[PDB]
Design a protein around this ligand. Structure first.
Ligand code: ADP
Ligand code: L47
Ligand code: MG
Length: 330
């Protein structure tokens, strides 16, 4: 039930000049990814896997958005909660997929930058959709990040990243939590997005000077909530509330990452149909439990490297993401 997809990144400059031989092969049509475990294109053994969708190195941000993100966003507009995880070793594309980058030399405005990822495209589209038709709506974003089991708010511009938020159980709706003091920044229009994203970027920079390998060891949860009061061409009015969570997990390669360890153990119990699911054993799984066997539509995008040097890690990632497919929620 949970939809899982694989994105393989292309070789980098340094890999090209070294005559890199990709040990990975993608077949979008057949929804298959193949990896050369033994070695040698003349003769070799390989490992094969099937997923809901597969994307090779030739895949651009726009293909990713039109294919996975557009449909899930439409659901969010309908009043549903959706989450999308990015999983994989550091250097494979988790941040590139989730956030995106800027093209060199100020070649494009942020809303037309082909290298832009899911977050900016989504915030830009929400306004692109609801504005067109007749819909009164409010957009609020939030960026919660977990490092060594401590919560941080990377969007609040009146407190630095030394102040870790506190987390409690929500007495109202069970299996839900309350993060004290987390900031919800309202986005009044498309032309207010970039700066808010710039804000988080800069705080993210101070977090990195303060915490070791911060960009590799932390989990970021960027949430976008949409309050809608749609008024049909007739005169009806729908009050819908949709929430989309975009998670850039900490690098899966292998001190300890309690949330990462716990996430793996939660998937295990969900697919093994084990009664006790260890949600409470980490901050991430308590924050996102409804995304794991709950009433939320969730998608996992596992990013892999083509380089033969990451064969062992490419296998763990694929194997890890293939098991997730058996998870059922809603
Ligand atoms: N699909 C892709 N297309 C072009 N470049 C990519 C792609 N995926 C990753 N890269 C490049 O690979 C490097 C790894 O980036 P990053 O997204 O930060 O990895 P991660 O988040 O998995 O640690 C970056 O320099 C990035 O520009
Ligand atoms: C380069 C930059 O400052 N960006 N910063 C981003 C960002 C930072 C924090 C939280 C969420 C996002 Cl997503 C992403 C990105 C971006 C935004 C818009 C268009 C792009 O091409 C890249
Ligand atoms: Mg990264």
């Amino acid at each position: 039930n949970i939809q899982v997809v694989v994105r393989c990144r292309p070789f980098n400059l340094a890999e090209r000049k070294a005559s890199a031989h990709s040990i990975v092969e993608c077949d979008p049509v057949r929804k298959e990814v193949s990896v050369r475990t033994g070695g040698l294109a003349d003769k070799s053994s390989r490992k094969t896997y099937t997923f809901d969708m597969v994307f090779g190195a030739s895949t651009k941000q726009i293909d990713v958005y039109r294919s996975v993100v557009c449909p899930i966003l439409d659901e969010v507009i309908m009043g549903y909660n959706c989450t999308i995880f990015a999983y994989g070793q550091t250097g494979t594309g988790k941040t590139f997929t989730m956030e995106g980058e800027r093209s060199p030399n100020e070649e494009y405005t942020w809303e037309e930058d082909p290298l832009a990822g899911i977050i900016p495209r989504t915030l830009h589209q929400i306004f692109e959709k609801l504005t067109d038709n007749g819909t009164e709506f409010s957009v609020k974003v939030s960026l919660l990040e977990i490092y060594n089991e401590e919560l941080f708010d990377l969007l609040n511009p009146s407190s630095d990243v030394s102040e870790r938020l506190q987390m409690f159980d929500d007495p109202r709706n069970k299996r839900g939590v309350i993060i004290k003091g987390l900031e919800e920044i309202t986005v009044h229009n498309k032309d207010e997005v970039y700066q808010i994203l710039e804000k988080g970027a800069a705080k993210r920079t101070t977090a990195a000077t303060l915490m070791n390998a911060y960009s590799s060891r932390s989990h970021s949860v960027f949430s976008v909530t949409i309050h809608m009061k749609e008024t049909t061409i007739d005169g009806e009015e729908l009050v819908k509330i949709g929430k989309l969570n975009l998670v850039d997990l900490a690098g899966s390669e292998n001190n300890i990452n309690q949330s990462l360890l716990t996430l793996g153990r939660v998937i295990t119990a969900l697919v093994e149909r084990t009664p006790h699911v260890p949600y409470r054993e980490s901050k991430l799984t308590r924050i996102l439990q409804d995304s794991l066997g709950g009433r939320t539509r969730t998608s996992i995008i596992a990013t892999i490297s083509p380089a033969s040097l990451n064969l062992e890690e490419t296998l763990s990632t694929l194997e890890y993401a293939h098991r997730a497919k058996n998870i059922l929620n809603k």
